[PDB]
């Protein structure tokens, strides 16, 4: 009752600039009501066709009621079930889902399917550190969530 969501970050990876990237931006706009920011490759990676500094992904930060809602959609897709691996030592956590359509976005054969990354940074409604275990029982109590053993 005294631990809150500070922000939810979302990210869709494509790997190169073009149609599929720009469509991943739209998906984030539809899903989120905000404009996403394109990410650039940190390194070129020959065997994956990645070039340094190329736009290759899109991300968006959401706060407040919007963040809670999107998180819930994500958790429902995951059936409210994460692993201890998903929880950082900082008291934050994240996870992925295979298909964005499962949040309730319509499938378009033109668009295709996107994987989606979630990262949730927690905070206190006020600087005392949030442990990995506090975030775990927060998730367990607030969402009746299940945290599978570490793999």
């Amino acid at each position: 009752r005294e631990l809150r969501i500070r922000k939810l970050c979302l990210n869709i990876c494509v790997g190169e600039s073009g149609d599929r990237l720009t469509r991943a931006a739209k998906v984030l706009e539809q899903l989120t009501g905000q404009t996403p920011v394109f990410s650039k490759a940190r390194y070129t990676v020959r065997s994956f066709g990645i070039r340094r500094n190329e736009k290759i992904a899109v991300h968006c930060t959401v706060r407040g009621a919007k963040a809670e809602e999107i998180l819930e959609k994500g958790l429902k897709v995951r059936e409210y079930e994460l692993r201890k691996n998903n929880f950082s030592d900082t008291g934050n956590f994240g996870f992925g889902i295979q298909e964005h359509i499962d949040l309730g976005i319509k499938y378009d054969p033109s668009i295709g399917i996107y994987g989606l990354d979630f990262y949730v940074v927690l905070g206190r409604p006020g600087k005392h550190r949030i442990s990995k275990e506090e975030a775990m029982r927060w998730f367990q109590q607030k969402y009746d969530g299940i945290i599978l053993p570490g793999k």
């Binding site: 500070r6 922000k7 970050c9 990210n11 990876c13 990410s39 490759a41 940190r42 390194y43 990676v45 065997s47 994956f48 990645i50 992904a57 991300h59 995951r78 059936e79 079930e81 692993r83 691996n85 998903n86 950082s88 030592d89 900082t90 934050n92 994240g94 996870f95 992925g96 889902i97 295979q98 994987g115 990354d117 990262y119 940074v121 570490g150 793999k151």
Partner: protein, 42 residues
């Protein structure tokens, strides 16, 4: 780069040992996927 997270939010790629920001969930050096991020299939 981002004041709301720390290095403790970073994950270590087990293929090449690169420290990677929370997002994306593949390694920025070698592209290897992070383990136990996605739901496990049956």
């Amino acid at each position: 780069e981002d004041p709301e997270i720390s290095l403790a939010d970073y994950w270590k790629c087990t293929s090449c040992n690169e420290m990677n920001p929370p997002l994306p969930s593949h390694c920025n050096r070698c592209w290897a996927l992070r383990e136990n991020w996605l739901p496990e299939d049956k």
